[PDB]
Amino acid sequence: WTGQESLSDSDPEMWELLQREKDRQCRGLELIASENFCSRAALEALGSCLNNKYSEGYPGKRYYGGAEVVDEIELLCQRRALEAFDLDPAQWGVNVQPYSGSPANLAVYTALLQPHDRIMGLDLPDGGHLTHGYMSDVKRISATSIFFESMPYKLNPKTGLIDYNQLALTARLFRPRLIIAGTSAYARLIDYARMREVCDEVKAHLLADMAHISGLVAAKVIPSPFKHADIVTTTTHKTLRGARSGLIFYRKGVKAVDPKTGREIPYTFEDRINFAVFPSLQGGPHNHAIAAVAVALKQACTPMFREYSLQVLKNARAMADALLERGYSLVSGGTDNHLVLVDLRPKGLDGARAERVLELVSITANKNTCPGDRSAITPGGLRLGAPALTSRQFREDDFRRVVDFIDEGVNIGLEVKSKTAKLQDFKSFLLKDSETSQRLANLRQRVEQFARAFPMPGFDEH
Amino acid sequence: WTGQESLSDSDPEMWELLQREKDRQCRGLELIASENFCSRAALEALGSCLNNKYSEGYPGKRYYGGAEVVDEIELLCQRRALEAFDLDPAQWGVNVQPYSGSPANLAVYTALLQPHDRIMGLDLPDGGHLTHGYMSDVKRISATSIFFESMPYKLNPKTGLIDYNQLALTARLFRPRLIIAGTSAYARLIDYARMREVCDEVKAHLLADMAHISGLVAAKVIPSPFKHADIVTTTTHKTLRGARSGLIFYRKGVKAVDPKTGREIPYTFEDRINFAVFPSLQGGPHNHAIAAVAVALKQACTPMFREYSLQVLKNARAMADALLERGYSLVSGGTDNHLVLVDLRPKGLDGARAERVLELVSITANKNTCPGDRSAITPGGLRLGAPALTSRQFREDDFRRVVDFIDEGVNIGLEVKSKTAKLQDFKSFLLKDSETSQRLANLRQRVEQFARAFPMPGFDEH
Ligand SMILES: Cc1n[nH]c2c1[C@](c1cc(N3CCCC3)cc(C(F)(F)F)c1)(C(C)C)C(C#N)=C(N)O2
Ligand SMILES: Cc1n[nH]c2c1[C@](c1cc(N3CCCC3)cc(C(F)(F)F)c1)(C(C)C)C(C#N)=C(N)O2
């Protein structure tokens, strides 16, 4: 045994599963707004010998030696991260060690807040992320709500936007120490200037969690959260198109100067953010991930990536405009970003029904809660995203064509719904009924033929 | 841009960094007890298209669709995990999603304990891990000690062993809800049965954190903590020789049938452990890592891996014996596992000095506190481990040869100590002094010539 044998030779069972998954990704239409397709360059770094190195600590301040190269990789991943979002090294530092986006958020809270300190984030059904705080009536769901005290801020159910007025009303009562500006499922831009007004008034920190939009921010196709935010967290995946990992950007240097004291009052984020990641929360850095992130961060600095990002926005608008023109309602009436929230209630359907039908024809999207949701349990919408298929060289016409493929699925969903009682019965009907089955089997076959012809990033067979 | 370019062409700067690290690993003698060299098979899964899938939730209970293949991968990784450790699926379950070892531990505490509930782990300078609790005289350092209340237990400095008597004494007073059996720097086998008695007495959960020894446990070359623990956490790297990730094993089924009532009492770990990992702490699984772990767990079931693990013990013994023969002192007198704790104080040198000299001749080990010494004093010991070099096919003679090189390094360290006063003098004298610089260069070249000839697991170039 050398440990230099191929995966295909040494573990055929696993190799076939990778080939089955690679086939699935190629043949399908990926409309999940959080998914993308990572470059081969990044994945090569991700499966490198950098997996074999323990480098607890930070560049120049490690616990073990033999860390000369990984220091250069970490410092390069930092520099490239700052470059990718056009940040001055004197004003911003960055931590590249978080294992994902959820760890990066917990690290920020741990760094800046005492246990049980107060956090405000967009409510989960209103398009927020679990890690911004989430409790049900019976239990604390997110660990953010266990170790800290979270109160959600809501959407205006008329405009479908973030009610910035009610945020400011509740924030001055609840008195949070941190407010989170970021979203999982929201088609519009965030008023980071307004967020900072509220955070300034009530003496709170502003955290921008740009996970979903980080590529769009680097490409400068939408406005930057870095103009108004104290702290920015992100996934390195999603629109950035990197490996699964996380970043924490923080302000550094001088914040303010008081004329009375006659001196500079520095930002105190750096040491606390870094200490919270390590030694407080994480163990050994995943240097292979850090290197794969740095590969993607270089890619994001290029003209190529900007044109990809402009094409994401166009393809979202094209998917939005095409839905409107085929009789669909959109939450907030459209989009200014990579995704579209389709209210299926005004076309007499829900999200759960649409999801399972589309899935069966190799179209993967997720159900979504809309402001107009009459029922709290069964969600009445659909989140569709551009980034993935755009990375496969999809243009507007291709996106108009997937809308037509979707519409055919929705229209099967509307037909199966009217010949059905429950959501349990709705799934029994799709699998069993030959006329629905074969009409899906035909739609799948077309979707797969349409999808397969487009290029796929990464390796050829896995 | 296809995203199918090679890293070498795509990002030459990153490619040259990977190549330097590969050279450093190949030419070094890796004696860090936490290190290993991952198989190419495992690293191929790690840099696969599985990075592209979001599969929040668990197999058959996902939040998105299109997860049929990743479901099979996660279920396969679970089966192979239970098989590697010879566990009955009726009696044991396993979560394969933790992003690393430290996340796996935090998920356990989150799952079973309330904030501020009490944990006891082996003190950090006594050889426990940061995640078991650590506070300095003025600051909570580990997140375990921020969100929960940790009190350490200590070694008996006479024997270098865990003082099981004092643990039982202090546990009756402190009343921990959870006690952690597991170590980072400990040469001996833990008395899990005695840990169990103390836990049964004070009504505490026993957690076995077997990160360092997991491969030895899988190979059945040392006793298993699964015979006495409620929960077992581990890394998937270190002695298991996989990609960086974590596992949480837990009892399931019937705990004990109460004969007074008559009814069976169930274990209630499964749902709580799984909920803590997701949705409470983590987001999307790292399916690429999960698949790599599945490859490594498969490797760990084979005769090959048992022979590897026996060799790791023999090589550590051989290194211990070879150190004893050259007049070195070992903490606890020797070893029953993969590592050796050298006490350098008797020979008139410390761990900080030795570590840096050894680093400059391509031998990577780490300094370690000896029992009795306070943590504020410069550590007088050195931790050395067999697994990494054993994976490069080192045998007993080769480790004796390794001890020759270490001894030379120590002797160089002794000579530089007599010519300098402080640590910053010692460290700089190694770089600046001509005679010392030459002697190190000679030794380095001999170490590197020796190391390069042995095979290296992984890819050829990176
Ligand atoms: C898992 C998750 N993390 N962050 C999320 C989610 C979403 C989500 C959360 C949740 N919940 C988290 C715990 C229980 C509710 C449920 C659902 C679903 F699909 F069942 F409706 C969806 C979704 C992106 C998957 C979700 C929705 N809808 C939103 N808005 O943000
Ligand atoms: C980082 C870590 N996590 N878990 C550990 C450590 C060790 C460790 C912890 C620490 N500390 C963590 C916070 C400050 C002390 C310091 C040192 C050293 F090398 F500086 F002495 C070593 C070591 C394996 C690296 C360490 C030692 N010595 C032990 N016993 O276990």
Q: What is the C-alpha separation between B283 and A106, in angstroms, rounded?
A: 12
- Name the residue with tokens 């807040």: A113
Give the nearest ligand 2 atom to B34 CA.
24
Helix-helix angle B423-432:B434-452, to 10 degrees: 80
B63 Cα: distance to centroid of ligand 1 (angstroms): 7
Q: Is residue A153 helix, strand or coil?
A: strand
What is the rounded end-to-end Cα distance, in angstroms, of chain B? 23
Instruction: Check CB contact under 8 Å for B52 and A69.
Output: no
Give the nearest ligand 1 atom to A379 CA.
21
- The beta strand positions in B381-420, using DSSP E, are 381-385
Q: Is A369 tagged catalytic?
A: no
Which of B13, B44, B50 lies at the smallest CB-CB distance from A21? B50
CB distance B144 to B124 below 8 Å: no
List alpha helices for B214-326, DSSP H.
214-219, 270-275, 287-299, 303-325
Which of A49, A134, A356 lies at the smallest CB-CB distance from B22? A49
Cβ neighbors of A16 (< 8 A, separation 6 or more) are none
Q: Whose CA is nearest to atom 20 of ligand 2?
A: A63
Instruction: Check CB contact under 8 Å for B37 and A70.
Output: no
- Calculate the alpha carbon distances from B63 to A139, A356, A359, B164 in Å: 19, 12, 13, 46
CB distance A186 to A153 below 8 Å: no
Q: What is the C-alpha separation between B396 and B382, in angstroms, rounded?
A: 20
Q: What is the C-alpha separation between A369 and A348, in angstroms, rounded?
A: 15
Give the nearest ligand 1 atom to A125 CA.
30
B350 token code pair: 């410390």
Cβ neighbours, 10 Å, residue B452:
12
Interface test with B, best of A10, A14, A62 (most B CBs within 10 A): A14
B369 pocket-lining for ligand 2 (C-beta < 6 Å): yes
Name the experimental technique.
X-ray
Domain range summary for chain B, segments of one domain joined by + = 39-301, 302-462
Interface test with B, best of A6, A8, A11 (most B CBs within 10 A): A11
Q: Is residue A55 helix, strand or coil?
A: coil
Interface test with A, best of B44, B362, B382 (most A CBs within 10 A): B44
For domain A302-462, give its CATH number from 3.20.20.10, 3.40.50.300, 3.90.1150.10, 1.20.120.420.
Answer: 3.90.1150.10
Cβ neighbors of B340 (< 8 A, separation 6 or more) are B187, B316, B319, B320, B323, B330, B334, B383, B384, B385
Q: What is the C-alpha separation between B139 and B187, in angstroms, rounded?
A: 29
Q: Is A54 tagged catalytic?
A: yes
Q: What is the C-alpha separation between A280 and A274, in angstroms, rounded?
A: 9
* N residues, chain B: 462
Chain B closest CA to A458's CA: distance in Å? Answer: 5
A369 pocket-lining for ligand 1 (C-beta < 6 Å): yes
Q: What is the C-alpha separation between B151 and B434, in angstroms, rounded?
A: 49
What is the rounded end-to-end Cα distance, in angstroms, of chain A? 24
List alpha helices for B341-395, DSSP H.
351-360, 387-391
- Calculate the alpha carbon distances from B181 to A115, B126, B221, B226, B296 in Å: 27, 13, 19, 11, 24
**Do A39-301 and A302-462 fold alike per CATH?**
no
CB distance A235 to A214 below 8 Å: yes
The gap from C-alpha A455 to its chain's centroid, in whole angstroms, comes to 23
The gap from C-alpha A326 to its chain's centroid, in whole angstroms, comes to 28
Give B297's contacts in chain A (Cβ within 8 Å): none
Whether cis (ω within 30° of 0) applies to the bond prior to B279 is yes
Give B2's contacts in chain A (Cβ within 8 Å): 455, 457
A160 pocket-lining for ligand 1 (C-beta < 6 Å): no
Handedness of CA B431, B433, B434, B440 (dihedral sign): negative
Q: What are the residues facing A95 on neighbouring strands?
A: A248
A58 Cα: distance to centroid of ligand 2 (angstroms): 14
Chain A closest CA to B442's CA: distance in Å? Answer: 18
Q: Whose CA is nearest to atom 18 of ligand 2?
A: A63
B379 pocket-lining for ligand 2 (C-beta < 6 Å): yes
Q: Whose CA is nearest to atom 17 of ligand 2?
A: A63
Cβ neighbors of A268 (< 8 A, separation 6 or more) are none
Q: What is the C-alpha separation between B48 and B40, in angstroms, rounded?
A: 12
For residue A428, is it left (φ>0), alpha (ψ between -120 and 50) or beta?
alpha
Q: What resolution (Å)? A: 2.5
A143 Cα: distance to centroid of ligand 1 (angstroms): 15
- The beta strand positions in A315-403, using DSSP E, are 329-330, 339-343, 363-364, 366-367, 381-385
A129 pocket-lining for ligand 1 (C-beta < 6 Å): yes
- Strand B339-343, strand B363-364: pairing: unpaired
Q: Is residue A93 helix, strand or coil?
A: strand
Closest C-alpha among A300, A307, A394 to residue A39: A300
Q: Is residue A457 helix, strand or coil?
A: coil
B184 pocket-lining for ligand 2 (C-beta < 6 Å): yes
Q: What is the C-alpha separation between B318 and B184, in angstroms, rounded?
A: 21
For B457, nearest residue in chain A (alpha carbons): A3
Give B42's contacts in chain A (Cβ within 8 Å): 7
Q: What is the C-alpha separation between A355 and B330, in angstroms, rounded?
A: 63
Q: Whose CA is nearest to atom 15 of ligand 1?
A: A124
Instruction: Check CB contact under 8 Å for A49 and B99.
Output: no
Cβ neighbors of A173 (< 8 A, separation 6 or more) are none
Closest C-alpha among A48, A47, A66, A49 to residue A57: A66
Q: What is the C-alpha separation between B134 and B127, in angstroms, rounded?
A: 12
- Calculate the alpha carbon distances from B118 to A117, A313, B209, B404 in Å: 21, 51, 17, 46
Q: What is the C-alpha separation between B153 and B160, in angstroms, rounded?
A: 13
Amino acid letter, A423: L
Amino acid letter, A163: D
Q: Is residue B58 helix, strand or coil?
A: strand
CB distance A320 to A331 below 8 Å: no
Helix-helix angle A396-418:A434-452, to 10 degrees: 170
Whether cis (ω within 30° of 0) applies to the bond prior to B371 is no
Q: What is the C-alpha separation between A395 and A170, in angstroms, rounded?
A: 43
Give B21's contacts in chain A (Cβ within 8 Å): 48-50, 53, 69-70, 73
Q: Whose CA is nearest to atom 5 of ligand 2?
A: B129
- Calculate the alpha carbon distances from A183 to A213, B156, B231, B259, B279 in Å: 9, 53, 35, 53, 17
CB distance B187 to B334 below 8 Å: yes
Q: What is the CA radius of gyration of chain A?
A: 23
Measured from the alpha carbon of residue A132, the closest ligand is 1
- Calculate the alpha carbon distances from A148 to A62, A135, B114 in Å: 31, 11, 13
Measured from the alpha carbon of residue B355, the closest ligand is 2
Handedness of CA B33, B181, B79, B47 (dihedral sign): negative
Give A28's contacts in chain B (Cβ within 8 Å): 66
Q: What is the C-alpha separation between A7 and A5, in angstroms, rounded?
A: 7
Number of A to B CB contacts under 8 A, please give it: 317
B373 pocket-lining for ligand 1 (C-beta < 6 Å): no
- Name the residue with tokens 């890394």: B235
Amino acid letter, A417: K
For residue A241, is it left (φ>0), alpha (ψ between -120 and 50) or beta?
left
- The beta strand positions in A230-311, using DSSP E, are 231-235, 246-251, 254-258, 263-266
A150 pocket-lining for ligand 1 (C-beta < 6 Å): no
- Strand B118-122, strand B178-181: pairing: parallel
Largest CA distance in chain A: 81
A238 token code pair: 């999603």
A127 pocket-lining for ligand 1 (C-beta < 6 Å): yes
B39-301 sits in which CATH class? alpha beta
CB distance B232 to B225 below 8 Å: yes
A42 pocket-lining for ligand 1 (C-beta < 6 Å): no
B432 token code pair: 């600046």
Which of B39, B63, B69 lies at the smallest CB-CB distance from A3? B39
Give B11's contacts in chain A (Cβ within 8 Å): 41, 295, 298
Instruction: Check CB contact under 8 Å for A4 and B48.
Output: no
